Design an enzyme around this catalytic site. Sequence first.
Site, mmCIF file in Angstrom:
data_model
loop_
_atom_site.group_PDB
_atom_site.id
_atom_site.type_symbol
_atom_site.label_atom_id
_atom_site.label_comp_id
_atom_site.label_asym_id
_atom_site.label_seq_id
_atom_site.Cartn_x
_atom_site.Cartn_y
_atom_site.Cartn_z
ATOM 1 N N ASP A 4 1.052 -3.332 7.135
ATOM 2 C CA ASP A 4 1.719 -2.100 7.573
ATOM 3 C C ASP A 4 2.080 -2.362 9.169
ATOM 4 O OD1 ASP A 4 2.442 0.306 7.733
ATOM 5 O OD2 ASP A 4 0.200 1.347 7.804
ATOM 6 N N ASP A 27 9.224 -0.253 9.094
ATOM 7 C CA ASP A 27 7.892 0.345 8.496
ATOM 8 C C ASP A 27 7.444 -0.261 7.154
ATOM 9 O OD1 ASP A 27 5.387 1.291 7.948
ATOM 10 O OD2 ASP A 27 6.039 3.416 8.140
HETATM 11 C C1 LIG Z 1 -1.230 4.196 7.038
HETATM 12 C C2 LIG Z 1 0.039 4.500 6.277
HETATM 13 C C3 LIG Z 1 -0.182 4.307 4.770
HETATM 14 C C4 LIG Z 1 0.605 3.785 3.959
HETATM 15 C C5 LIG Z 1 0.334 3.713 2.448
HETATM 16 C C6 LIG Z 1 1.092 2.991 1.609
HETATM 17 C C7 LIG Z 1 2.040 1.699 1.977
HETATM 18 N N1 LIG Z 1 2.906 1.272 1.212
HETATM 19 C C8 LIG Z 1 3.097 2.028 0.204
HETATM 20 N N2 LIG Z 1 2.814 3.038 -0.431
HETATM 21 C C9 LIG Z 1 1.660 3.809 0.642
HETATM 22 C C10 LIG Z 1 -1.003 4.348 2.133
HETATM 23 F F1 LIG Z 1 -1.131 4.228 0.992
HETATM 24 C C11 LIG Z 1 -1.691 4.865 2.676
HETATM 25 C C12 LIG Z 1 -1.434 5.013 4.181
HETATM 26 F F2 LIG Z 1 -2.195 5.604 4.786
HETATM 27 C C13 LIG Z 1 0.346 5.900 6.532
HETATM 28 C C14 LIG Z 1 1.649 6.686 6.036
HETATM 29 S S1 LIG Z 1 2.860 5.496 6.423
HETATM 30 C C15 LIG Z 1 2.228 4.017 7.055
HETATM 31 N N3 LIG Z 1 2.963 3.183 7.389
HETATM 32 N N4 LIG Z 1 0.866 3.532 6.892
#
Ligand SMILES: C[C@@]1(c2cc(-c3cncnc3)c(F)cc2F)CCSC(N)=N1
Length: 388
Positions: free
Chosen positions: A36, A232
């Site tokens: 991430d 991102d």
């Molecule tokens: C930490 C976070 C994030 C991403 C995904 C996630 C990742 N990839 C695909 N779907 C959901 C997830 F499932 C939970 C999260 F908390 C916050 C929202 S935006 C971000 N960049 N990270």
Amino acid sequence: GSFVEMVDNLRGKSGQGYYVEMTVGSPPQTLNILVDTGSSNFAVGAAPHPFLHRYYQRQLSSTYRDLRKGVYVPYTQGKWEGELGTDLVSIPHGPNVTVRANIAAITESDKFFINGSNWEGILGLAYAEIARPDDSLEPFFDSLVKQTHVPNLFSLQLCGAGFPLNQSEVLASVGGSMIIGGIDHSLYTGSLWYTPIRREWYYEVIIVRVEINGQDLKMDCKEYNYDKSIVDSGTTNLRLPKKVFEAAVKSIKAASSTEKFPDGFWLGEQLVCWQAGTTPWNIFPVISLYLMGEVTNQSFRITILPQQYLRPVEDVASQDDCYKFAISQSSTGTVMGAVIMEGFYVVFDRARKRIGFAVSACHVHDEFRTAAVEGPFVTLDMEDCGYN
Ligand SMILES: C[C@@]1(c2cc(-c3cncnc3)c(F)cc2F)CCSC(N)=N1
């Protein structure tokens, strides 16, 4: 040049995230971890959850250190709470080093873990400024660089399949590469073009022009970066500020106007389906984002296809090819998410405070059009595009 040990070390897909295998603790506990670039905490499931098949067990690690501090992390959708600690961490298909890193042991969560995603934690690769509870909690990558000789750079090739994968196919399939400490020349074609990292918190960049099939969206460039523009890997969609989203959708509708699609499609809610093999890619426009270059008054552009911004999904019933529109609105600025990153090999050159883009060797395209990275363009007053 060549990093064979790290090539093909990711699995997953844009809708649920791409993940890398890591181990934590002594003896090593294996976990799959979401990559991430939009967050800065290393946080792992550490207690039973219906969607977790395994989790970090701190009591079985002889090297676990308790920091005696809680952390609470809410997002717009979902939240988690945990306990801060440190432990030894490795990446099996990564550099052959072991580092002591901060780990948030997640003890409670709401709508955070995704059923069937196959990941059990998140590796936040962005900077300390956005770490929780505060910037004194050193992020994983900062630890890795401080403790080892790994160069302060990583690169990501996210590979979209171009068609749906069930939970069995994702397990068996290669989803891409995270090259830690370098750039692997097999992962891209053409040249790498670099844009400056505006400020080290998110990976913030500046967009200077947007075109849909070569037609300038003609907005004041500040609108494109209101209130920031970031790269991102943990966001599925290309997300655009409200007013830019409205302009872009109007233009994409006009370009594709030989077919009429329901409002729910354009809202990202509902799928559209075509008979197998007949998706009319050519009726949808290419999208170009021009980014600030490293040379004064110079920009370059990255161009994506509908094969990037239409996300393949399984049908609610068939042999049809079905998709959702993967561009959506944001109230927190532009997000160049996974569906954009799937077009490109992206180099996060932290050492030189710059992000590189090259055409991905694995991007989905057709016989008539490919994704592109092209330059230079003479562009004036680019710093004025950044929002303050
Ligand atoms: C930490 C976070 C994030 C991403 C995904 C996630 C990742 N990839 C695909 N779907 C959901 C997830 F499932 C939970 C999260 F908390 C916050 C929202 S935006 C971000 N960049 N990270």
